[PDB]
């Protein structure tokens, strides 16, 4: 039996469903992540994504910086709080252009029935994400220097 097969039956769609892409697992983990969830309101997703990057940006600006050889973690603290606020400009300005009239997603599931469209892509959508990326980011940054410093 072939490990690799056409995309959900269709062999004339630009993709190949490998055991990397489609499998018993991976289809369960990626849905567990904040962004891919369909039924939840647009507030709580942005916080769960936004917070996370506040810790991925936090470690960095401590040990490699100019004041690495000394204010080393105060130095690294608000600099992680920054790429947060710029992303918020990037994501608020990303939103400012795109959405003028109604959403646009692959409406159905793998099962193929017409499920309700997500608020991930809408006028009131990316706003609460852009807010989630801020309140998550700014607060989420503070806890990489209440634990490593204070």
């Amino acid at each position: 039996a072939q490990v690799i097969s056409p995309v959900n039956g269709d062999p004339f769609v630009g993709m190949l469903e490998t055991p990397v892409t489609s499998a018993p697992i991976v289809a369960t983990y990626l849905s567990n992540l904040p962004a891919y969830r369909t039924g939840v309101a647009p507030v709580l997703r942005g916080v769960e994504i936004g917070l996370a990057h506040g810790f991925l940006l936090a470690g960095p600006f401590i040990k490699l910086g100019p004041l690495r050889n000394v204010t080393a973690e105060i130095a690294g603290s608000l600099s992680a709080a920054g790429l947060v606020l710029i992303l918020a400009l990037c994501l608020s300005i990303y939103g400012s252009a795109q959405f003028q009239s109604t959403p646009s997603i692959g409406v159905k599931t793998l099962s193929g029935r017409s499920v309700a469209r997500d608020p991930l892509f809408s006028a009131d959508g990316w706003s609460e994400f852009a807010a989630g990326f801020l309140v998550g980011g700014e607060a989420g940054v503070a806890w990489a220097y209440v634990c490593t410093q204070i």
């Binding site: 400009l89 300005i93 252009a97 795109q98």
Partner: peptide, 29 residues
Amino acid sequence: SWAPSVFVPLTGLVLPAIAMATLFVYIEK
């Protein structure tokens, strides 16, 4: 150190920051 502490980082960031922002919105919309 009074003037150039203010005007250098505003011309360095805050002028291009809102320029790249308000010119992006002029392009796409």
